[PDB]
């Protein structure tokens, strides 16, 4: 797991993202960065491009990871609810499913049709 | 006459006017102003609405009263003239009615075709 793998050979600022996505810790850049006899200005240009591509690409990867981390959270709560419903069903209680989702959405969006106090007294009444 | 009557029950900032018009000295406001568990901000909003509705509505009522007070004044003067004409008719004088109204309108609008001096010497001549 801890061995760092570097792609070397035909890596470009455009494709760098795909190497990093595939599991490369980084890359060695040859002809696409420096070819013998190019200007210092070309070296500064290509090096800027690769740093940008890495950091932009790395940033994108981090954002994707964050998104994925956010994303499951929902699933675990959705399953939690699904299983609670099945528990309720065995006690003869069958909850309207669309409303349950509508509550989640509305509250998350700061537009719950119930006040926090209402929500709390309703759940207490539901217990009863 | 001096008993103050307060409407309580289903009074809104929208209908408050009609209660005040009907003879209510004021109103008690319950659920439409405060329901248990609403925010302090909602209380300030509804209370602002009712004060506005009262003062706007009260203002409208006062304006209507002023209008009514202005309005009769005319009637009493119109009757005064009508009766003076009938008096003149018995002396064999029949005044052009449209002109009489035209004088009232023009002068009131600051566009009398006669100067104040003219008006006064004409009335003196009419006496004769």
Swiss-Prot record, chains A, B:
- What turns on expression? Part of the dgoRKADT operon, which encodes proteins for the metabolism of D-galactonate. Negatively regulated by DgoR. Expression is induced in the presence of D-galactonate and galactose.
User: Please, which domain of life does this record's source organism belong to?
Assistant: Bacteria
Whether Lyase counts among this entry's keywords is yes
Q: Where is this site: Plays a major role in determining the stereoselectivity?
A: 8
- Ligand binding (2-dehydro-3-deoxy-6-phospho-D-galactonate): 10, 30-31
**Outcome of gene disruption:** Deletion mutant cannot grow on D-galactonate.
> A GO molecular-function term, please?
2-dehydro-3-deoxy-6-phosphogalactonate aldolase activity
UniProtKB keywords: Carbohydrate metabolism, Lyase
GO BP terms, alphabetized: D-galactonate catabolic process
User: Quaternary structure?
Assistant: Homotrimer.
Q: What does this protein do?
A: Involved in the degradation of galactose via the DeLey-Doudoroff pathway. Catalyzes the reversible, stereospecific retro-aldol cleavage of 2-keto-3-deoxy-6-phosphogalactonate (KDPGal) to pyruvate and D-glyceraldehyde-3-phosphate. In the synthetic direction, it catalyzes the addition of pyruvate to electrophilic aldehydes with re-facial selectivity. It can use a limited number of aldehyde substrates, including D-glyceraldehyde-3-phosphate (natural substrate), D-glyceraldehyde, glycolaldehyde, 2-pyridinecarboxaldehyde, D-ribose, D-erythrose and D-threose.
Assigned protein family: Belongs to the KHG/KDPG aldolase family.
What is the designated name of this protein? 2-dehydro-3-deoxy-6-phosphogalactonate aldolase
Organism of this sequence:
Escherichia coli (strain K12)
Q: Describe which stretch of the whole protein the shown chain covers, with first residue, last residue and complete length.
A: 147 to 203 of 205
């Amino acid at each position: 797991s801890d061995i760092a793998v570097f792609a070397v050979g035909g890596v470009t600022p455009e494709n760098l993202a795909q190497w990093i996505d595939a599991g490369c810790a980084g890359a060695g850049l040859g002809s696409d960065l420096y070819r013998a006899g190019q200007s210092v200005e070309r070296t500064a240009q290509q090096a800027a491009a690769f740093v940008k591509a890495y950091r932009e690409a790395q940033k994108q990867k981090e954002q994707r990871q964050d998104q994925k981390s956010a994303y499951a959270l929902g699933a675990s709560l959705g399953r939690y609810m699904e299983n609670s419903l099945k528990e309720q069903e065995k006690l003869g209680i069958k909850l309207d499913k669309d409303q349950l989702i509508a509550g989640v959405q509305d509250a998350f969006a700061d537009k719950s049709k119930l006040s926090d106090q209402e929500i709390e007294q309703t759940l207490q009444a539901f217990e009863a």
